[PDB]
Write a sequence for this structure.
């Protein structure tokens, strides 16, 4: 999406690949975790993501 | 999920009139031209295609 | 049966028609031993009431009491419920403090109040707010009794809002006004409808504090129930002209019809229990020197004099008569609305404002707005009868719809509107921070001067 | 210059200690010019004439303090209610010392009833602290009542909100029945063995007989009851190894009497520090309006912090109870109440006595089973859950996929297509 | 230095530390017009985008009724106080009492 | 005046089952009531037409 | 410790790694010494040379996707944070019980 | 009529501090209401003029 | 530390101009100071490329 000339389009869309996600690694024993999870699901659950 | 959001009110009023029990009912209805569109998960619809 | 009648000084009701409340009443008298004892009392002290209970209980076995109050002491109703847990006699609290909403009734008492619960009155008030489409509101609750289940019902109603009610958080006051911490809680309110939950003189003090701080504008509405208001005859100081109250003490539906219907219910209960069980008189002999067939779990289904006067499971009427009043500019609590059987009807759907609140409060905030039906701009649709609510991205409007082609009468139809100009008006009300007065045109199109007539 | 004090008390020794403590209260508390007097009522069985004597002795005396001081009344209803219901005519606080029920804990049912005796919700908080000690989460709650049971459930949800977690199972029923064994067998198949009970004597005896019949007195059963469950035949029916709680110095009468006198005395002196003090008038002579300094007196009383006390640091909470009261953890060993610990404040102090469980060792039995068996619920999902009727009886055809992988089916149980 | 140069130094500190959400509490202390005016002509002329809360004014000895609310209308980070020394002691004691 | 759960959540929270093996709609509604795990499927919504 | 008992637990030590669609770490404005307000400040522990280990903290600007996520979390969760960079390298690799 | 009767000390001999009830005097004077006067009614704005 | 307008506004506000007859981009900021006429031309923006 920023390629000069746009001569590179990858094979597939993750169908024959790992297809993982990205998250936030918190320390074991943090009370912030449920609040951060609710905030992320609010950020996805309204179209803002 | 659409009832929470800020602009999905008319589509909510349209979808609440003809809610279906199973997804196979929706498949048979859109197959028999009773429906014309259906919101559904993408890869399941690719498998059904 | 033998039923005692005692009152105070409510509505200047004479005792003569109370003594004459036996002749034409109960024309189909199947129980023979039905008599009345109709008296009065100078005072409202509960100890003398206990004295009269112990006098009349041994007074030829009186098996009934119909008591009404003129004051605002709800503890007298608690004393009568305690006596009904001792004498086990069905006692009807009619008006005043004898029928006020206490916290939690017990199954070990047969005392009955007339009216509805505080949650049903809150449902009626939220039905009023739904009919008037005022969605951004506040809730100020003190340590006034009955607060727990009332605030819980408000929270479950806002959490179950198909309307999408914007409730500002619960302003709590542990004590009276400190003028340090309670003032900050009063100045957090920027909503439209302020809901106050306290006693009468506490409401006078809170309205005086709000008027002294300028929190009593026509943007800042005030709706209180009957238990916050108190006596309908006494109107104290610092009331905004337009004070919405919901009560049931109508001067058109007076005390005499209430006590006649109550005696009709008691004689109906006596006749219904007489056809089922024989030994109906079962009472305590005398109060000195200390549960078979009662009427508490017996009169759930009853419809007396046509109107539904049935009993709830929590000791109230199923369908009472609700009266919604406001305050005019003449310091009078004027009757506005009544309640239907199932739903709620309102006479003044068009809402007056009663501008004379203070020395000067201008109506420059509101702007008269009229438009024409335009498919990309003014999208006009019906109101949903299943919800009776325009959804929150749409705004309601009124239309003067004429009935016939050669008449001068027309009604007002409220319809929903969405579109481009709706969004423009909403964003102008966000930025310029004004209020809108939206209605529809009845003469026709945009404009054309037909011989110096537009 | 005289002020009467209303007390529901009949013993002359406690009244002598009361008058001596009043003389102590008027001794060093400043140059204030009040004098104090006692007025106490004795035992009468007839509760109507009890309330009659109470209101005749409260109206005709101009009292400031009303102290109910008879817990073991011969009436099984145990109702000090009409005293507070009469004093609510002027919103006068009755400072009783008898009951420990959540139906009395309401500021809405009882208008201004203050006390220094806590209900069983504080015992539930002590049990929550004990669970914080033994590091347990999942419980089984059984409350026989419904009036105090809702307040106990709300206090339990408050403790869960402090935990920021949830409980497992709560139950309520109607007392008088005897086939609550089925609910205990439903609670058996859970993943915890922690039993919390809120009941009277009869319901406790019924569930102890049920525990004797359903083999609920084996190993791992964690029993946790309170005060109304360790009396009567339920004390006889209690299994050896059950844990009870008892607050110290409550059954000893005169010490908490003296603590109440110190609280009332310092409250009256800090009330009479300021000006414009009104008095509750005589309700029998022309006085039907409310006492105007009712909420003022409640602001003084509910915000009264104390550093004096025979029991300890007494202080009223947001509901009008004792902050951080002392408790004693008792255990039953061969039908003998053996003390196995105490609890002040926020900290548990177990003594050097054997904390013996109804099962095996003195260490805690973890009733959290390994849960080898699970229950899978599903819907007929069109890409995922393919449901086929069986061939003959409960059998599945061992079919293959396109790669020779056999389709490993499972014998599931499904309802009909349309439920109504 | 003048009060404008010292305000320039303080806003240079705030620019080096990037505390964009701030406030301004000015009493009846002398030099208040040019001070607030220079804060206006520095923040409003800035390309940074400073989050400027409106000016809270304290007139006299506090009634602790309206001035308490005006102190509790501050939810920013930086609180700029403009008074004398004993008035600073009184305002910081009130802010410690109000949290 | 309470919205209660039925179906799979209504049977799980009542203790009738132990695990809902299903294409769970992980959202902000159900996160406020139960705890979650990591998703196995990464899938979007679209429109079926003719 | 502004006072005796003050809970300060809203401070969150946050380190990140430079990624072109996510963590865009760029220079400061050389004319105003100011990060543009959609960016956030960061410090980088730049050592003197390869011989010594002590170094300074160069302040740089940060935009991108994860910066927007952090700003929206600071709007929602309402915490405080400190942003810096690690010089040991990439995301994570345990070199014989040494990450 | 009010309390906190403070007096400005004699600053010439042995008095160096400031008069701490200055804004107290401002609260007394600048909030005065008038309904009588020979030349007419005086009233205080934020500046305190006629 | 003061920002000033110049150019056509600097020639107009000084009294050295009476009417700027020019299709000016009517924005919000310049209309906050002086009154503007009715916009006769409706014209947008575009990009010139080779
Ligand atoms: C008995 O009561 C006191 C009441 O305070 C409690 O002691 C507290 O606990 C900590 C534990 O380290 C002690 O250091 C302090 O003396 C007390 N702190 C506070 C804030 O009160 C405790 O519940 C019991 N005694 C013990 C074990 O300290
Ligand atoms: C009591 O009776 C007198 C007449 O004897 C009357 O004037 C008074 O109003 C009565 N009291 C009340 C509460 O109405
Ligand atoms: C009243 O009548 C209806 C219909 O017969 C029935 O539900 C019941 O007998 C009464 N109402 C109650 C208690 O449900
Ligand atoms: C309401 O109920 C009364 C009494 O049953 C009845 O007479 C009246 O017609 C009803 N009105 C309507 C239409 O709801
Ligand atoms: C008015 O006139 C129209 C056209 O003749 C007719 O259809 C309608 O019934 C009349 N009634 C109304 C709406 O006033
Ligand atoms: C007036 O309108 C009503 C309602 O449509 C209709 O019933 C009536 O016939 C009309 N009047 C006439 C005579 O046109
Ligand atoms: C105290 O009260 C009792 C009972 O009312 C009374 O007999 C006695 O005289 C009183 N004593 C004094 C003087 O306070
Ligand atoms: C309780 O009821 C069930 C119903 O099946 C019965 O099997 C069981 O024996 C009963 N138990 C008691 C305690 O009677
Ligand atoms: C049940 O009773 C048996 C009797 O042998 C005993 O061994 C066991 O410990 C008891 N506990 C259980 C498993 O309920
Ligand atoms: C109650 O406590 C006091 C003080 O500790 C003690 O002297 C007295 O003996 C105790 N009384 C009883 C009944 O134990
Ligand atoms: C006594 O007077 C004060 C005003 O000085 C006022 O709060 C109220 O009228 C009374 N109550 C108390 C004790 O403050
Ligand atoms: C419990 O008893 C101890 C004895 O030292 C005392 O210090 C403590 O205050 C008591 N707790 C309370 C508040 O009852
Ligand atoms: C459930 O209902 C039908 C009704 O005919 C019954 O025959 C069958 O056993 C079940 N079938 C389905 C759809 O599960
Ligand atoms: C030491 O560090 C600098 C950058 O700070 C760079 O030129 C190179 O790494 C080394 N050279 C010297 C001596 O500057
Ligand atoms: C440190 O080592 C690197 C890699 O050899 C090289 O750039 C140069 O020798 C030194 N300078 C720095 C700080 O990179
Ligand atoms: C005197 O000053 C103190 C402290 O500001 C204040 O509490 C008190 O009300 C003042 N008294 C009067 C009326 O001057
Ligand atoms: C100002 O002039 C009017 C008209 O002469 C006069 O009545 C008024 O008294 C004057 N103002 C004063 C002196 O208050």
């Amino acid at each position: 999406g920023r390629d000069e000339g746009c001569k590179l389009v990858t094979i597939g869309s993750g169908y024959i690949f790992a297809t993982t996600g990205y998250g936030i690694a918190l320390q074991k024993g943090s009370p912030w975790k449920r609040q951060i999870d609710l905030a992320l699901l609010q950020f996805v659950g309204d179209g803002e993501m | 999920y659409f009832r929470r959001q800020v602009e999905l009110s008319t589509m909510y009023r349209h979808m609440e009139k003809h809610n279906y029990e199973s997804a196979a009912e929706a498949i048979q209805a859109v197959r028999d031209n009773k429906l014309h569109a259906f919101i559904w998960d993408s890869a399941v619809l690719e498998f059904e295609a | 049966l033998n039923i005692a009648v005692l009152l105070g000084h409510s509505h200047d009701v004479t005792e003569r028609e109370l003594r004459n409340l036996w002749g034409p009443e109960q024309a189909t008298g199947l129980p023979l031993d039905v008599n009345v004892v109709a008296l009065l009392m100078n005072r409202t002290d509960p100890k003398s009431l206990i004295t009269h209970v112990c006098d009349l209980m041994s007074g030829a076995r009186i098996h009934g009491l119909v008591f009404g109050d003129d004051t605002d002491q709800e503890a007298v109703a608690q004393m009568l419920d305690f006596i009904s847990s001792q004498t086990f006699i069905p006692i009807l609290g009619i008006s005043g403090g004898a029928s006020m909403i206490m916290a939690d009734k017990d199954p070990t008492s047969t005392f009955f109040q007339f009216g509805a619960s505080i949650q049903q009155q809150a449902t009626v008030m939220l039905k009023i707010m739904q009919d008037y489409d005022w969605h951004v509101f506040s809730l100020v609750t003190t340590i006034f009794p009955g607060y727990r289940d009332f605030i819980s019902f408000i929270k479950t109603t806002v959490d179950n809002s198909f309307v999408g009610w914007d409730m500002q958080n619960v302003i709590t006051l542990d004590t009276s006004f400190e003028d340090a911490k309670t003032q900050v809680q009063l100045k957090k309110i920027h909503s439209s409808v302020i809901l106050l939950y306290c006693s009468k003189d506490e409401a006078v003090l809170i309205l005086s504090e709000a008027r002294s701080l300028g929190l009593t504008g026509y943007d800042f509405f005030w709706i209180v129930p009957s238990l916050v208001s108190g006596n309908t005859e006494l109107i104290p100081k610092e009331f905004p002209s337009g004070l919405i109250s919901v009560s049931y003490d109508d001067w058109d539906y007076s005390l005499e019809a209430r006590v006649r219907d109550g005696l009709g219910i008691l004689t109906t209960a006596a006749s219904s229990m007489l056809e089922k069980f024989s030994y109906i008189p079962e009472a305590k002999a005398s109060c000195y020197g200390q549960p078979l067939h009662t009427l508490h779990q017996f009169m759930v289904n009853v419809t007396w004099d046509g109107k539904d006067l049935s009993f709830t499971e929590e000791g109230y009427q199923v369908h009472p008569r609700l009266v919604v009043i406001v305050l005019n500019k003449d310091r009078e609590w004027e009757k506005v609305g009544k309640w239907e059987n199932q739903t709620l009807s309102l006479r003044h759907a068009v809402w007056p404002r009663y501008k004379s609140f203070s020395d000067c409060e201008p109506d420059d905030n509101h702007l008269s707005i009229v438009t024409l039906e335009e498919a990309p701009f003014v999208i006009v649709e019906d109101i949903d009868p299943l919800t009776e609510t325009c959804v929150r991205n749409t705004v309601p409007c009124r239309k003067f719809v004429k009935i016939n082609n050669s008449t001068n009468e027309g009604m007002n139809v409220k319809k929903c509107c969405k579109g481009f100009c709706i969004d423009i008006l909403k964003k102008l009300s966000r930025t310029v921070k004004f209020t809108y007065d939206l209605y529809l045109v009845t003469n026709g199109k945009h404009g054309k001067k037909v011989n110096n007539v537009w | 210059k005289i002020v009467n004090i209303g007390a529901v008390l009949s013993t002359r020794k406690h009244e002598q200690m009361f008058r001596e403590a009043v003389n102590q209260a008027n001794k060093r508390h400043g140059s204030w010019k009040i004098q104090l007097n006692a007025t106490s009522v004795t035992h009468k069985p007839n509760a109507i004439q009890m309330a009659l004597s109470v209101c005749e002795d409260l109206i005709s005396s101009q009292v400031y303090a009303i102290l109910v001081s008879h817990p073991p009344t011969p009436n099984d209803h145990f109702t000090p209610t009409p005293v507070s219901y009469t004093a609510g005519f002027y919103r006068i606080p009755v400072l009783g010392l008898t009951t420990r029920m959540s139906i009395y804990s309401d500021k809405s049912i009882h208008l201004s009833f203050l006390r220094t005796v806590p209900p069983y919700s504080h015992q539930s908080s002590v049990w929550f602290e004990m669970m914080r000690v033994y590091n347990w989460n999942h419980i089984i709650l059984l409350v026989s009542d419904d009036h105090e049971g809702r307040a106990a459930q709300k206090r339990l949800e408050t403790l869960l909100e402090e935990r920021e977690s949830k409980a497992e199972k709560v139950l309520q029923f109607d007392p008088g029945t005897k086939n609550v064994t089925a609910l205990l067998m439903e609670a058996r198949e859970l993943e915890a063995r922690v039993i919390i009970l809120s009941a009277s004597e009869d319901d406790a005896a019924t569930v102890y007989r049920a525990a004797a019949m359903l083999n609920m007195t084996g190993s791992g059963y964690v029993w946790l009851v309170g005060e109304r469950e360790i009396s009567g035949n339920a004390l006889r029916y209690a299994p050896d190894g059950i844990i009870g709680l008892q607050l110290i110095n409550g059954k000893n009468e005169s010490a908490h009497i003296s603590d109440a006198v110190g609280v009332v005395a310092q409250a009256v002196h800090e009330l009479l520090e300021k000006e414009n003090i009104t008095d509750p008038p005589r309700g029998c002579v022309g006085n039907t309006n409310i006492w105007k300094t009712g909420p003022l007196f409640k602001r003084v009383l509910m915000s009264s912090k104390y550093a004096d006390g025979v029991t300890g640091r007494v202080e009223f909470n947001e509901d009008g109870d004792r902050k951080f009261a002392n408790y004693s953890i008792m255990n039953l060993q061969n039908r003998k109440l053996v003390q196995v610990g105490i609890y002040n404040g926020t900290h548990v102090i177990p003594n050097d006595r054997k904390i013996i469980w109804p099962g095996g060792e003195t260490e805690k039995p973890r009733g959290y089973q390994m849960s080898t068996r699970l229950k899978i619920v599903t819907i007929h999902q069109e890409p995922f859950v393919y449901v086929k009727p069986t061939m003959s009886d409960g059998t599945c055809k061992e079919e293959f996929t396109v790669n020779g992988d056999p389709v490993k089916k499972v014998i599931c149980t499904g309802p009909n297509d349309t439920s109504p | 230095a003048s009060i404008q140069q010292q305000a320039t130094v303080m806003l240079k500190i705030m620019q080096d530390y990037d505390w964009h959400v701030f406030s301004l509490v000015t009493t009846i202390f002398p030099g208040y017009r040019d001070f607030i005016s220079f804060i206006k002509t520095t923040v409003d002329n800035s390309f940074v985008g400073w989050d400027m809360q409106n000016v809270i004014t304290l007139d006299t000895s506090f009634e602790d009724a309206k001035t308490q609310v005006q102190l509790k209308k501050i939810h920013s980070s930086v609180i700029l106080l403009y008074c004398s020394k004993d008035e600073a002691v009184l305002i910081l004691s009130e802010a410690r009492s109000l949290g | 005046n309470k919205k209660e759960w039925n179906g799979m959540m209504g049977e799980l929270l009542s203790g009738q089952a132990d695990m809902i093996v299903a294409p769970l709609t992980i959202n902000n509604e159900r996160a406020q009531y139960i705890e979650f795990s990591k998703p196995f499927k990464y899938q979007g919504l679209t429109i079926l037409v003719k | 410790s502004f006072s005796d008992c003050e809970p300060d637990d809203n401070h969150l030590s946050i380190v990140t790694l430079e990624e072109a669609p996510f963590v865009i770490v760029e220079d400061i404005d050389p004319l105003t010494e100011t990060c543009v307000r959609n960016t956030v400040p960061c410090r980088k522990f730049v050592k003197i040379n390869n011989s010594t280990n002590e170094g300074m903290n160069v302040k740089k600007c940060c935009k991108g996707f994860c910066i927007d996520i952090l700003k929206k979390l600071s709007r929602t969760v309402k915490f405080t944070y400190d942003l810096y960079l690690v010089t040991n390298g990439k995301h994570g690799k345990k070199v014989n019980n040494v990450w």
Notes: Residues 366 and 435 of chain C are 5 Å apart (CA to CA).
